[PDB]
């Protein structure tokens, strides 16, 4: 009855160790432009400055 209450605590601490190692991996994972910039307007493509615009300036 004491070895099982050992193993419960050790299971509950290896759960926290794996929880930390996961949450440290989750930080260095790269993130989408829709999550790490504005959600609305998910493109990085500008089309900026359109009053005297020349066709052929797009690429």
């Amino acid at each position: 009855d004491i070895l099982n209450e050992e193993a419960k605590i050790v299971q509950a601490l290896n759960n926290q160790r794996e929880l930390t190692i996961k949450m440290h991996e989750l930080k260095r994972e790269e993130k989408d432009y829709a999550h790490s910039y504005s959600p609305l307007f998910s493109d990085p493509v500008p089309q900026g400055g359109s009053i005297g615009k020349a066709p052929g300036s797009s690429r």
């Binding site: 990085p44 500008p46 400055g49």
Partner: protein
């Protein structure tokens, strides 16, 4: 903001190279931006014309070494009151 707005409100001189680089970075995740190098190189030398000035001094150093100099259809300079003279 005013990312690519020119003096007349249009697009600036290096907008097309910048928008091409932004096309390159839009479809591309990190650890694979090494292919996105030539678009950036094109943009930076659109801005500052470094490779262009390098090429022009490489050909100007040869131009002063010839005694013949110029055997080509030449470029004629005009004064400002003589745009359409002849």
């Amino acid at each position: 903001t005013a990312a690519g707005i020119s003096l007349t409100g249009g697009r600036n001189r290096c907008f097309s190279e910048w928008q091409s680089f932004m096309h390159c970075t839009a479809k591309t995740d990190a650890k694979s931006r090494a292919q996105c190098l030539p678009n950036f190189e094109d943009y930076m030398e659109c801005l500052h014309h470094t490779k262009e000035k390098a090429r022009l001094r490489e050909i100007e150093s040869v131009l002063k070494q010839k005694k013949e100099g110029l055997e080509a259809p030449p470029v004629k300079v005009i004064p400002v009151k003589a745009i359409g003279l002849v």
